[PDB]
Amino acid sequence: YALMVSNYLNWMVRNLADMEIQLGAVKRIHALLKTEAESYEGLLAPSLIPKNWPDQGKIQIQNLSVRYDSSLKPVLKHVNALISPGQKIGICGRTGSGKSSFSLAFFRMVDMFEGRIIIDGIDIAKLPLHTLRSRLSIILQDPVLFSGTIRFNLDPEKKCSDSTLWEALEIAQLKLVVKALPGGLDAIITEGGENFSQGQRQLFCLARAFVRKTSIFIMDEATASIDMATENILQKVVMTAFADRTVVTIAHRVHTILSADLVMVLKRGAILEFDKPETLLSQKDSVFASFVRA
């Protein structure tokens, strides 16, 4: 047994140091395991939520002021607006005016420390996050694609048929491009969509939102990576295909929202102007007229 001490004292000390290093990895996993979670429960009862709680698409915004964290500056200050169902709302302003946080406010991705967003008579703070975020579609400015087929990127849960996917691709000007690929809807999108262009990746994300077929679409500078020629026909076919649906279009180019029903001009997180573009362009001193003229 003394020879075993001579062989195993070193092995015991080595395994103790190793076990300390392994418990470091367990410690890092537990430290990541104690991170806070979003409140997915929701105060409103699931029976009180109808089967299609965006029944028509009415949006009321009452004294909304949002921020991203506690002890941080509110990126929106006293936002108050009404959106009748079926109305098209163009949102314009300079970069940094809180108009993407406005789009994120409908999905509760920002800290709404005061104010309410009532959609069809239901406050969205009372609702579960999956319930809120499943009945609304958003198109971010930056495309996010995943590895897999085109069918997997448009419909990962396989809840829609091939005709719906082809309508979504045809609206997003990708019928000919996807049909030219030999797989078709089974054509492989690489990690981050590197086998497609930036505009084609963004059109894939637009078609990804067109599959869902909700009542409220929020297009947050979707056509920034798209050329003007195909942007105009894409805007026209989105307006015709979603004529009965409330669309909140955030304009990378202001001339795209000249045909909108109402235009929300944001200045430094405050709605300076919220009116029809025909009356808004009639005023010479209006900021929206300076956006269109320059």
Binding site: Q22, A25, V26, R28, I29, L32, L33, T35, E36, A37, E38, Y40, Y68, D69, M109
Partner: protein, 50 residues
């Protein structure tokens, strides 16, 4: 013991990450989150039971 802890810790980590807010994902670098699945999980699955 190694199989049980290796299953349960990855299940808990994967379920707790997807419920964390986007403020956490923007603040924390993705390497710090991903290395728990890559290296620390590899230690717990393989190196720790040995």
């Amino acid at each position: 013991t190694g199989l049980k802890v290796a299953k349960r810790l990855h299940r808990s980590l994967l379920n707790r990450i997807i419920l964390a807010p986007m403020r956490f994902f923007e603040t924390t670098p993705l390497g710090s989150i991903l290395n728990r699945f890559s290296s620390d999980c590899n230690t717990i699955d393989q190196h720790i039971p040995s």
